[PDB]
Design a protein around this ligand. Structure first.
Ligand SMILES: *[C@@H]1O[C@H](CO)[C@@H](O[C@@H]2O[C@H](CO)[C@@H](O[C@@H]3O[C@H](CO[C@H]4O[C@H](CO)[C@@H](O)[C@H](O[C@H]5O[C@H](CO)[C@@H](O)[C@H](O)[C@@H]5O[C@H]5O[C@H](CO)[C@@H](O)[C@H](O)[C@@H]5O)[C@@H]4O)[C@@H](O)[C@H](O[C@H]4O[C@H](CO)[C@@H](O)[C@H](O)[C@@H]4O[C@H]4O[C@H](CO)[C@@H](O)[C@H](O)[C@@H]4O)[C@@H]3O)[C@H](O)[C@H]2NC(C)=O)[C@H](O)[C@H]1NC(C)=O
Ligand SMILES: Cc1cnc(N2Cc3cnc(N[C@@H]4Cc5ccc(Cl)cc5C4)nc3C2)nc1
Ligand SMILES: [Ca+2]
Ligand SMILES: [Ca+2]
Ligand SMILES: [K+]
Ligand code: NA
Ligand SMILES: [Zn+2]
Length: 805
């Protein structure tokens, strides 16, 4: 109940939201149907429109007008944005030459450059080039400022998840806005686009930028705008707030446009109807920049032009129906569209079985346009599992498609030609970033980056300490002229042991065999030198990884590879080796097919055993350093050490053996040598973080050998591929993956075919950042390069996406 009989007199677009039942005059009062009776009359004036005309110049102030052309308007801060152009012979901002802004040029009393975030819904990255002829204001911000070719959204590529990630620096699984539609089983409550449940603060986790600012004494404008407030009025309100007294004036502001998303859904991303919305957004940017120029703020404010996601061609005829796969379609609830989330219709249905639903949706039709996943099996780069609002069953929908439960859902609710929500590496989902202002760089192109990084940067721009978030603070320092964040590398928590030869062969009762009984002072000396680390410089190019948790591990050196061997998890945490462009691939010799060799540096009590693998009828083993890439027949014996062995399902070994035998040498050929770091990951609680021992759900039968959930590899080379990876003077190039350790290849519908037809497709889907591997392992890589630490942080955030232009 609201007492709407109160008044918005002297309260229009007030920043402090007032308590029911008192009536409101803030920019969301319309959305809560709570505005005072006179809000439209006082706060949403439209009389004479939005532009000064020659006949209005020097007019007697009429308080009824939407904006003013009277001599007093600049001091009142309520001129039409074109006032000085029409009435005082000034130029539009867009007609001024670009001039580097080296320092803030602010009015007296400004304590910091304000930040204005200009957010555009559904603004696909390629609009910056394809729409450039119709967006001159945006093209000036882009060319004169700091721009990325695109910015990667979070999954799902929906509005609320992405705007709240921009606000918080968090993945949706952490901030809790995991879709535009959600059911929380603990609250027993549903969140929807339409309705009032979404205004309950219990949905929204983390600490958004406006709260971070307010808590640190930095005032914020209200970021959300009721849809009925015209864009011109949003701009004039921001310009009016910027004219407040010093003690009252916010330092951070947001503008939001529902376009071009609104038109893109109707017409498709490149429908001819899309030109006019892009022209209208550009005109709005021009109104803001002209307005700032009038207030002498156009060389004072930092401006961010940023989108939430892109837009794909999607039509009603490209819909998959679950009714074509499931017998039981009325016993499920589907969250539908550009992703699918399935749960039981009723928690009283004891016959609901996720396993039978997954099996019924798996590789059933030759051109099937979705793939089912248990959420823990989704690519780790999506960080889309650790939230009770994310249903256990997920459908990853192909670009250009929808999934629905039954056909009547599509025609009892064709219309639309555009949609978004797909995998955040899809080119059509990419969006925009431009920064313009004293704190940003001038005429600078930066590599594409992820929207989780921008919270940290917006905190840097405002002198705020960020709340804990999923950005890597310092990874975007190359966007900034000043206010860079200069972190120190994390302290190593656990120092390695360096064991020598300490055990005789007969102390080991592992059930292993090897045909290695084969008997020289020259080469005796070399073998000893290799074990002491004589080749370590070749194979550990960037220093050993630091272990950032308390554990017991050993460094083990070999001719061809170095490892950090866990005495707790009975396997390497990491295995590092370098393969030159010239490297030769060899076989596992017949006589060594089943060879496993005790490591006389490592106690039998801290070793795996072969009998466990014999007894476990599901689990086999592989090797982290590949015997295929041995430097010599003698060095090959090292690759069969029990300390190089890891548990692998036969299905996984098909992938792993093809990676090791074919793909590593292909990458060394293509990149002029590669350095590889490989290892296990344990994430049984799907939280993206290194498991403790007590979280491990599966062991090799009858043993204490834990089974990884994933295997990673980090593949590094010289960005200048004319230099070999092991003699690189400059910046590095990385690609990584986190492959799921699964007992079948059901994810790969073509897995009956030769590994050349499906293994690389799998690896591309499970591409990763080094930072994703750092979270999952508690290791810190690249500690000893001759590169800037911020450059290394940028490298650690890189994702190799495998999308064409
Ligand atoms: C991305 O960045 C974020 C931010 O840094 C990282 O997330 C953090 O991860 C930490 C480890 O998972 C986590 O730490 C836990 O915090 C608990 C306190 O949590 C409350 O307070 C904080 C601070 O204000 C607040 O942010 C939290 O907000 C979460 O929860 C509310 C819902 O209640 C949500 O609205 C909000 O969206 C957010 O939810 C997200 O996180 C929770 C986990 O907190 C998930 O369950 C959600 O799905 C969602 O992902 C909270 O309001 C603290 O109690 C925990 O401590 C317990 O566990 C540790 C184990 O190490 C143990 O040592 C302690 O003894 C303690 O154990 C006791 O509780 C156990 C569980 O009940 C029980 O089993 C034991 O027996 C004991 O009784 C823990 O410290 C931190 O909260 C989140 N923060 C956020 C914002 O998500 C994230 O990891 C990064 N991602 C990657 C991939 O790097
Ligand atoms: C179903 C549905 C979806 N979407 C919307 N719309 C209403 C609205 C109104 N205002 C905003 N303002 C945005 C919020 C935000 C967050 C971070 C940053 Cl950096 C800038 C901004 C500015 N966003 C929105 C989103 N409504 C309904
Ligand atoms: Ca959107
Ligand atoms: Ca974990
Ligand atoms: K076995
Ligand atoms: Na298969
Ligand atoms: Zn949309």
């Amino acid at each position: 109940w609201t007492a709407t009989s109160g008044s918005c007199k002297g309260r229009c677009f007030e920043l402090q939201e007032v308590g029911p039942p008192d009536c409101r005059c803030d920019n969301l009062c319309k959305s809560y149907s709570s505005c005072c009776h006179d809000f439209d009359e006082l706060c949403l004036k439209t009389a004479r429109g939005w532009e000064c005309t020659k006949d209005r110049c020097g007019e007697v102030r009429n308080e009824e007008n939407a904006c003013h052309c009277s001599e007093d308007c600049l001091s009142r801060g309520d001129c039409c944005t074109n006032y000085q152009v029409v009435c005082k012979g000034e130029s539009h901002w867009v007609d001024d030459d670009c001039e580097e802004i080296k320092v803030p040029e602010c009015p007296a009393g400004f304590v910091r450059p304000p930040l204005i975030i200009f957010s555009v819904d559904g603004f696909r990255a390629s609009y910056m080039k394809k729409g450039s002829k119709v967006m001159p204001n945006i093209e000036k911000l882009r060319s004169c400022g700091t721009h990325a070719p695109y910015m990667r959204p979070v999954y799902p590529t929906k509005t609320f998840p992405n705007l709240y990630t921009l606000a918080t620096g968090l993945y949706p699984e952490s901030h809790g806005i995991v879709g535009n539609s959600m059911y929380d089983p603990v609250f027993d409550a549903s969140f929807h686009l339409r309705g009032r449940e979404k205004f309950n603060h219990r949905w929204w986790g983390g600490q958004p930028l406006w709260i971070t600012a307010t808590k640190q004494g930095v005032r914020a404008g209200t970021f959300f705008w009721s849809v009925s407030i015209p864009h011109e009025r949003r701009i004039l309100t921001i310009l009016q707030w910027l004219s407040l007294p010093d003690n009252e004036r916010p330092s951070v502001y947001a503008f939001y446009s529902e376009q071009p998303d609104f038109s893109g859904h109707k017409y498709g991303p490149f429908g001819p109807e899309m030109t006019n919305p892009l022209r209208e957004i550009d005109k709005t940017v021009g109104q803001l920049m002209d307005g700032l120029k009038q207030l002498r703020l156009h060389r004072c404010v930092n401006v961010i032009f940023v989108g939430d996601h892109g837009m794909e061609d999607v039509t009603c005829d490209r819909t998959e129906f679950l009714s074509n796969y499931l017998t039981n379609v009325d016993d499920i609830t589907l969250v539908p569209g550009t992703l699918g989330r399935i749960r039981a219709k009723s928690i009283n249905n004891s016959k609901y079985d996720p396993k039978t639903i997954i099996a019924a949706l798996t590789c059933k039709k030759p051109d099937q346009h979705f793939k089912p996943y248990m959420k823990q099996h989704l690519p780790k780069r999506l960080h889309y599992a650790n939230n009770r609002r994310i249903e256990d069953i997920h459908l990853l929908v192909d670009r250009r498609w929808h999934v629905a439960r039954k056909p009547l859902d599509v025609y009892k609710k064709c219309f639309f030609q555009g949609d978004h929500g797909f995998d955040n590496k899809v080119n059509s989902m990419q969006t925009v970033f431009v920064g313009y202002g004293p704190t940003f760089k001038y005429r600078t192109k930066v590599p594409p980056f992820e929207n989780i990084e921008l919270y940290n940067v917006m905190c840097d721009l405002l002198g705020l300490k960020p709340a804990p978030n999923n950005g890597t603070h310092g990874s975007l320092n190359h966007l900034l002229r000043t206010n860079t964040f200069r972190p120190t590398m994390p302290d190593e928590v656990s120092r390695p042991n360096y064991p020598g030869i300490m055990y005789l062969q007969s102390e080991f009762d592992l059930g292993c065999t090897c045909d290695d009984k084969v008997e020289n002072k020259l080469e005796e000396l070399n073998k000893r030198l290799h074990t002491k680390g004589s080749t370590k410089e070749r194979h550990l190019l960037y220093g050993r990884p630091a272990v950032l948790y308390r554990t017991s591990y050993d460094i083990l050196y070999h001719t061809d590879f170095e490892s950090g061997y866990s005495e707790i998890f009975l396997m390497p945490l990491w295995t590092s080796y370098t393969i030159s462009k010239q490297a030769e691939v060899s076989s596992i010799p017949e006589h060594l097919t089943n060879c496993v060799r005790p490591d006389v540096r490592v106690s039998p009590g801290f070793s795996q055993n072969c009998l466990a693998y014999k007894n476990d009828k599901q689990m086999s083993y592989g090797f982290l350093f590949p015997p295929y890439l041995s430097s010599s027949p003698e060095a090959k014996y090292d690759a069969f050490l029990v300390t190089n062995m890891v548990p692998m399902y036969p299905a996984f070994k098909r992938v792993w053996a093809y990676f090791q035998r074919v793909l590593v040498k292909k990458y060394a050929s293509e990149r002029n040598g590669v350095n590889v770091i490989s290892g296990p990951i344990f994430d049984y609680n799907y939280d993206g973080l290194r498991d403790t021992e007590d979280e491990i759900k599966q062991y090799v039968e009858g043993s204490s050998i834990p089974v990884p959930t994933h295997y990673y590899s980090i593949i590094t080379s010289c960005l200048d591929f004319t230099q070999p990876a092991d003699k690189c003077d400059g910046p590095l190039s990385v690609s990584s993956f986190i492959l799921p350790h699964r007992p079948d290849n059901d994810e790969s519908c073509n897995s009956s075919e030769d590994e050349s037809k499906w293994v690389e497709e799998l690896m591309k889907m499970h591409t990763a950042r080094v930072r994703d591997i750092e979270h999952l392992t508690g290791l810190d890589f690249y500690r000893k390069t001759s590169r800037s630490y911020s450059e290394i942080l940028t490298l650690k955030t890189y994702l190799h996406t495998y999308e064409s232009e």
